[PDB]
Amino acid sequence: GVDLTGISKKSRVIRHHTYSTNPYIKLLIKLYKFLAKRTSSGFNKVVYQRLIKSRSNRAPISLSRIAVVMKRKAVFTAKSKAAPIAVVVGDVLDDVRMARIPAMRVCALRFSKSARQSIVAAGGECLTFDQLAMIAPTGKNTYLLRGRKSGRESVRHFGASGVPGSHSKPYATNRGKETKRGRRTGRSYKRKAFRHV
Amino acid sequence: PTRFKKCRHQRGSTFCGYGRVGKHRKHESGRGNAGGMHHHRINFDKYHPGYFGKLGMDHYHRKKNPMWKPTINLNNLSRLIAAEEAAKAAKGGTLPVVDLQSSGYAKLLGNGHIQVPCIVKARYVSKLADKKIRKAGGAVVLQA
Amino acid sequence: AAFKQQQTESFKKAVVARKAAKAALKKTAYLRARKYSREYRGAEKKLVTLRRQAASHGNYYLEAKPKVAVVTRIRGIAKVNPKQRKILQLLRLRQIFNTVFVKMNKPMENMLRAVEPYIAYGYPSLATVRAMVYKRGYLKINGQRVKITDNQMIKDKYNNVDIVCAEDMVNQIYTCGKHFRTVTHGMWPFKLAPPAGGMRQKRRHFVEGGDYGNRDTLINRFLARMI
Amino acid sequence: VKPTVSKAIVKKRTKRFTRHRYELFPQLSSSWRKPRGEDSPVRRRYKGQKAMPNKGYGSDRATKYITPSGFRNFPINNVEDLYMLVMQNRKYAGVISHTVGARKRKAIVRKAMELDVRLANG
Amino acid sequence: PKGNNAIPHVHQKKHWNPCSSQKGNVKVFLNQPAQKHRRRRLRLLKAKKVFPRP
Amino acid sequence: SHSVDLQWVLVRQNSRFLQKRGGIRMSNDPFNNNGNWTKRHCGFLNEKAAVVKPAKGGAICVTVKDGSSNNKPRQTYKKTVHAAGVRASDVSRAVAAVRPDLADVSFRRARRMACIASRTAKVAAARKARSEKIKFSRK
Amino acid sequence: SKNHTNHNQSSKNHRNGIKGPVPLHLHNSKRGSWLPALVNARRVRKHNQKAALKKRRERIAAFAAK
RNA sequence: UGAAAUGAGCGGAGUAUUUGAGCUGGCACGGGCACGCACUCUUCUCCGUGAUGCUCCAUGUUGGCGAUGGAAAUGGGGUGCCCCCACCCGUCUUGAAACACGGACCAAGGAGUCAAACAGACGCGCAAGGGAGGAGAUAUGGCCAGUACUUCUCUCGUACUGAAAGGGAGAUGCAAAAUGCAUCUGUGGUGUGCACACGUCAAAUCCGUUUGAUUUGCCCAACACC
RNA sequence: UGCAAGGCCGGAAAGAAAAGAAUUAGAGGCACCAAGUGGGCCUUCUUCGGUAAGCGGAGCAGGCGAUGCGGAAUGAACCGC
RNA sequence: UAAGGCCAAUUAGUGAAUGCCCAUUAUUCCUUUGGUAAGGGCGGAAACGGAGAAAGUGUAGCCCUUCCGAUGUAGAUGUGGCCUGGAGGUUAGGACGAAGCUUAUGGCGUGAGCCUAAGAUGGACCGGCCUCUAGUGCAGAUCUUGGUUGGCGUA
Ligand SMILES: [K+]
Ligand SMILES: [Mg+2]
Ligand SMILES: [Mg+2]
Ligand SMILES: [Mg+2]
Ligand SMILES: [Mg+2]
Ligand SMILES: [Mg+2]
Ligand SMILES: [Mg+2]
Ligand SMILES: [Mg+2]
Ligand SMILES: [Mg+2]
Ligand SMILES: [Mg+2]
Ligand SMILES: [Mg+2]
Ligand SMILES: [Mg+2]
Ligand SMILES: [Mg+2]
Ligand SMILES: [Mg+2]
Ligand SMILES: [Mg+2]
Ligand SMILES: [Mg+2]
Ligand SMILES: [Mg+2]
Ligand code: NA
Ligand code: NA
């Protein structure tokens, strides 16, 4: 035999195929698997990898965030070049906290109705990945973006709330119930707010 | 659906995943939330701090209707103005009028930067919200 | 049809380029092999003369200490302590009758001393190195274990102007040259057969009439029956 | 029609895998069941016991599912099914379903003779 | 083993389930569409009776 | 609007034309030259298609859908009835005029149909010879 | 009835290895340090942030110029 | 068994080529050179067949048996025999072949379910909003206990914090007011950090481009310190 | 104009020589959800109690339990694997 | 004049590395299966030995080539994995004989099982495929109910 102690611990868990039932998602996966295999661009490979992820791992993005990052990229651009196309593998939602935006071209899997209205009324354009593959088949002059995951209630609940240094929320339906011994100094003790490392 | 459950996969395995040594017995820990101070103390203290004890004053006959008081922020006011008036609005001119108690709000808070100036009618307002909206060119009118 | 025609046109030029490259590699390998053979013969003759000159006046000639060792594993995988297990893994000896070449310097010697009951080792000869490379030599290519069948794959694996052929690999291993680690790390560990004719005693040191430990230059007779 | 020739069939094992100790109790079928008893000699793989099936007994893929005549079986129920086999008639042979009656079997046999489609039980 | 779960308060400790020894204390809505149909039918009949009063 | 790719994704696993018996997947489609259940050979859902058929008196027919009447079932398929003396190369040329990727299978199918017609003639002669026997009922 | 031993414990501890310590440059908080030095360092950091904002504005203006 | 035979081995061309051994003319080696480094004997040499073939299968010689049958042959099935191998199943247990418990035979029956609260992972719709429930209205007066339509309400969320009376979150610049002032296309800063853009380097390439590394800009997600 | 701390602008860089002067079947880090188990036993080298024990209690490692196969006629744990 | 005990050999002062036998180990060859797998082909070249050629997690695997691993109690997970009663669809069968039953009836599958043959059996219903659903798989519980049985032509 061969001494291979603990070699199964080096294998990694990765997804090869989609669990989605959407035929249009399947068509997009077919196109971008072809492109990622037959082209050298890194854009196509990243896009193909992201199309296979689960819904929870494709977080939605905000129109205001798109505008802010595009402006920060634009202030250092030669002003003789066109602005890049914003590309998000996910959903784009509208933001009522920001009224005035510039005109941009955004490619996405799905748009909110109000977000599509805002982009078009600002003079911009909404795009599908099938049009993007015709316009920029290697991903030249693009800005690939991701949405935010921290901030979710499920993430804010992770871990034990009773150990020192932790600020996770407990699972409780009655907000006034767990507010006593263990959380106040006047009771037996209080869970410490800070711990080094 | 029954055909997807784990029992179907366990037909033929005599123990059904509960072991030979320690078995699947009736109530090996007590029933319900028993033992919270004796033999489940670690679980209770690590995952639910604050569970045991008393705190604060009592209030015998609570009515929620007299305490009703929803709030809305300054940078969310465009949710209450129709899109035709919002573009026409301009500081120093004619402004849309928003009635909060008819849209289901009682207090106006002052978080963020206001986007469309307007006249707001509210039962309550915070001092920073009042200052900010006056500087932006609107006003607050108290109502009941 | 233009796509097919252009593809065929490029294929023709590719074929002629491949043939020209093969023809060039053959001449380079020839010249290098001749150079190495002359070098070895000259070295041996010079050593013989030095010994004669010392003996004529009654002095002594000190041999250079060996630089390369060949190590094979002679025990199976059972009841091994954690420290020995770690050292054998780091030496790439994970299976009985696996063999490797190592540098014979201080850190390596102190590593080898700690696993003496598991190994047999010694100082190889040029014939042994040649036989191991030509008959039992495999390369790590793309993660796979691939048998050596021409100089072009050696050149492609190493991408170095000093390692282009099997004789280059042999020279680096035998003389402990500047690319010893590159050449040896590039190869799969050697997997040998049991020695025809048998062993003497697995459990005793070679000095006690057994098999394990350092048997010096006599490792070549041992390995000639395993390769 | 002659079938397309292939490599020689090998058949790693020809005996069946039968249940442990089924010859002693008439109510036990011979179909395979995995022994899970703690002291079972079959499960513990003693030298003189019955073998258990596993992945190493699998058939060569180039000759899997091929019958002794060299064809692969395809089940058919009526005359019209014979038209699926007319193009691949060097690969597949038809098997008439058991419950098809004699009246319809006559027509199936006549048509297959006309079309040169091999029937395994015709 | 219990892990990190909410502390349960499911309140089902009286004899509510009907079985061989208990009558139970249960209420189902399986007659809901029939009662809807019946109420509408009665309303139309009553309108015809009191015609032309609203 | 709805393309062949989407239609194939919709029907690949379940269709009235898919005969899956005893582990084998075949096709009932009358516009299929091969009997294989692949996208290329599904004539009922491809935009253009062509199929080789027999006719009465040892003749070869080619039926063609050309992609202009795909919303009218009674005009979708047109014919190229031809006499008995038709070369397999000619049938292949006619089919390749519509779809280049079916030329080889159309060629083989035409040859196979010719052989079938010959064999049917021979066996009919043999049967009508054997039937010199008394019978008790007719028609 | 009350047995104690350490027999299998090192073997258990080495299956997923003894993990190395976190590098010195991460999680380098100053909370609990000697107070006066902390108070001075805070003022220096505030001035540094102001300087960073000014430098970015100057860079943007220079790029706009050329 | 040559359906692309890559051969020092199959083919074409000549007779020479260059491997060693003896013997030959600056530095090294030792206190002269046994012959290290540089410039006659002994062997065969040079050249050649890409895949308009992506995959699978189809190709020698000599006998025996088989000329349509109660045939020959190969495989499968049954029963006996010989040589070798081989403790009784399930279970509790550190340990069962046990002098440890259950075990005469067969048929049919026989054990993780339904409901309710919460959570994580995965599928689907919409999104700063999502969704009812109860009920009504009219297609509608076996089909029809279904399907189609609906307000204004309710609920979860967009804001938290205090025992409570209560209070309630943008940025930059000037400035220092215990409700200061001015602008509003905008990441509060710092370190690490996809893709894209701008240059460089190394390797291979009918050789126009790939495969890696790296500088600078902006850095998405995310983590760390403020 | 010294010292302490945080930053900005520049330089250098056998990217770690020579002296026995490492090696790797050497991809680092970070989460979420959950099972079984919580009666052990044998051996090597140390040992404490006990007159001693196929006895009780411990330290380090390897095993059986959860495992056959080849040897020691036979043997859970010995030798080889 | 060991087939004992200590030492030492390998065909023997001849002149040159291995006397012989036996593993689920080692080397190598063939086949299966699974990967943190690695490459290539897939615009029908033309003409007319044979056929095929699917942009693809999983199949009778789209097709080739290559490399490495494979035992396991308690336990986890996967499976175009097997089987049973009923529902929505689709496609078929049956008095020229459905279900059920019988077997030295073979064939297929690593296996759960599936399919054909014969009945010198039966006499009216029922098979495949995609979805949906559950009172859905037995060798043992001093298990339940029915029927048999050795002891026994015995006491
Ligand atoms: K079989
Ligand atoms: Mg198990
Ligand atoms: Mg338990
Ligand atoms: Mg216990
Ligand atoms: Mg009190
Ligand atoms: Mg021996
Ligand atoms: Mg030992
Ligand atoms: Mg636990
Ligand atoms: Mg009763
Ligand atoms: Mg037992
Ligand atoms: Mg909240
Ligand atoms: Mg146990
Ligand atoms: Mg063992
Ligand atoms: Mg494989
Ligand atoms: Mg296994
Ligand atoms: Mg049941
Ligand atoms: Mg039974
Ligand atoms: Na948030
Ligand atoms: Na039922």
Q: Would you list the DSSP string of C91-103?
A: HT--STTEEEEEE
E11 shares contact with chain B (CB less than 8 Å): no
Relative orientation angle of helices C166-175 and C126-136, to the nearest 10 degrees: 140
Q: Which residue has the tokens 């063609």?
A: F64
Report CA D6 to chain centroid distance, whole Å.
18
Binding residues of B: 17
Task: Decide if B40 and E4 are in contact by the 8 Å CB cutoff.
Answer: no
Give the residue whose CA sits closest to H226 at C1'.
Answer: G45
- Among candidates D84, D86, D75, D83, which has minimal Cα distance to D1? D86
CA torsion sign, B20 to B21 to B25 to B30?
negative
Say how far apart CA A107 and CA A67 lie, in whole Å: 14
Alpha helices (H) along chain C: 2-57, 82-91, 106-113, 126-136, 151-158, 166-175, 180-185, 219-224
Quote the ligand 16 centre to D28 CA distance (angstroms). Answer: 21
What is the dihedral angle through the alpha carbons of A115, A118, A122, A126, rounded to the nearest 10 degrees? Answer: 30
Å from the D62 CA to the J155 C1': 72
DSSP annotation of C107: H
Tokens linked to B13: 């395995």
Give me the resolution in angstroms, 1 decimal.
2.5
Å from the C121 CA to the I70 C1': 28
Say how far apart CA C172 and CA C183 lie, in whole Å: 7
Quote the ligand 4 centre to B43 CA distance (angstroms). Answer: 22
Please, are residues C77 and A4 in contact by the beta-carbon 8 Å criterion? no
Tokens linked to F19: 């005969």
Give the E-state strand segments of chain D in sequence order. Answer: 72-76, 92-96
Task: Decide if E4 and A173 are in contact by the 8 Å CB cutoff.
Answer: no
Under DSSP, is residue D3 helix (H, G, I), strand (E, B) or coil? coil
F: neighbours with 3+ CB pairs under 8 Å?
A, D
Per 3-state DSSP, chain F is made up of helix, strand and coil in percentages (nearest 5) of 35, 15, 50
Nearest CA in chain D to F105: D87
Under DSSP, is residue D99 helix (H, G, I), strand (E, B) or coil? coil
Under DSSP, is residue C72 helix (H, G, I), strand (E, B) or coil? strand
Q: Which residue has the tokens 């079985």?
A: E19
Nearest chain D CA: its distance from B13 CA (Å): 8
- Among candidates A32, A43, A28, which has minimal Cα distance to A109? A28
Nearest nucleotide by C1' position to the G11 CA atom: I61
What contacts C113, CB < 8 A, 6 or more positions away? none
Q: Which residue has the tokens 């989605």?
A: A20
Q: Is the CB of C224 under 7 A from strand J?
A: yes
From chain D residues 30-89, the ones with a CB under 8 A of any chain F CB are 65, 72-75, 81, 84-88
For C93-110, letters b (16+ CB in 10 Å) and e give bbbbebbbbbebeeeeee
Alpha helices (H) along F79-102: 88-96
Say how far apart CA G19 and CA B31 lie, in whole Å: 40
Nearest chain F CA: its distance from A71 CA (Å): 37
Neighbours of B108 (CB within 10 A): 24
The backbone torsions φ and ψ at residue C118, rounded to the nearest 5 degrees and listed phi first, read -100, -10
The partner residues of F20 in beta bridges, in order of sequence, read F25
DSSP annotation of C217: G
Say how far apart CA E20 and CA F98 lie, in whole Å: 76
How many beta-carbon contacts under 8 Å exist across D and F? 35
DSSP letters spanning chain G: ------TTHHHHHTTS--PPPPPTTSS---TTS-HHHHHHHHHHHHHHHHHHHHHHHHHHHHHHH-
DSSP letters spanning B74-105: GGGGGGGS-HHHHHH--TTS---EEEHHHHT-
Element (H, E) at A34: helix A23-38
Which residue type does A138 have? T
Nearest CA in chain E to A161: E4
B14 neighbourhood in chain D, CB within 8 Å: 36
Say how far apart CA C87 and CA E47 lie, in whole Å: 99
The backbone torsions φ and ψ at residue C215, rounded to the nearest 5 degrees and listed phi first, read -110, 20
Tokens linked to G6: 């350490």
- Among candidates F57, F45, F58, F60, which has minimal Cα distance to F9? F45
Which residue type does G66 have? K
E7 neighbourhood in chain A, CB within 8 Å: 172
Nearest CA in chain D to B20: D38
What contacts A26, CB < 8 A, 6 or more positions away? A18, A20, F9
Angle, alpha carbons A13-A19-A21 (nearest 5°): 170
A172 neighbourhood in chain E, CB within 8 Å: 6-7
Say how far apart CA B53 and CA B46 lie, in whole Å: 16
Under DSSP, is residue A126 helix (H, G, I), strand (E, B) or coil? strand
Tokens linked to A145: 């973006």
Tokens linked to B119: 């006249």
B51 shares contact with chain E (CB less than 8 Å): yes
Say how far apart CA C51 and CA A122 lie, in whole Å: 94
Q: Which nucleotides of J are covered by protein (CB under 7 A)?
A: 8, 17-21, 24-28, 31-33, 35-39, 43-48, 50-57, 59-61, 66-71, 73-81, 84, 89-99, 107-117, 127-134, 136-137, 139-140
Relative orientation angle of helices C151-158 and C166-175, to the nearest 10 degrees: 60
Quote the ligand 1 centre to D21 CA distance (angstroms). Answer: 20
Å from the B75 CA to the H129 C1': 16
Instruction: Report the length, in residues, of chain A.
Output: 197
Say how far apart CA A80 and CA A131 lie, in whole Å: 24
Task: Decide if F21 and D75 are in contact by the 8 Å CB cutoff.
Answer: yes
Say how far apart CA C151 and CA C128 lie, in whole Å: 20
Which ligand is the nearest neighbour of the Cα of B18? Answer: 3
Nearest by CB: A197 against G22, G32, G60: G22
Touching pair A, C by Cβ (3+ pairs < 8 Å): yes
Nearest nucleotide by C1' position to the D65 CA atom: J108
G63 neighbourhood in chain A, CB within 8 Å: 75-76
CA distances from G27 to D33, G3, G4, G22, G30 (A): 58, 41, 38, 8, 9
Please, are residues F62 and F52 in contact by the beta-carbon 8 Å criterion? yes
- Among candidates A27, A24, A31, A46, which has minimal Cα distance to A134? A31
The backbone torsions φ and ψ at residue A47, rounded to the nearest 5 degrees and listed phi first, read -65, -40
Task: Decide if B51 and E8 are in contact by the 8 Å CB cutoff.
Answer: no
Counting Cα atoms < 13 Å in the Cβ hemisphere of E4 gives: 14
Task: Decide if A160 and E5 are in contact by the 8 Å CB cutoff.
Answer: no
- The alpha carbons of chain E give a radius of gyration, in whole angstroms, of 23
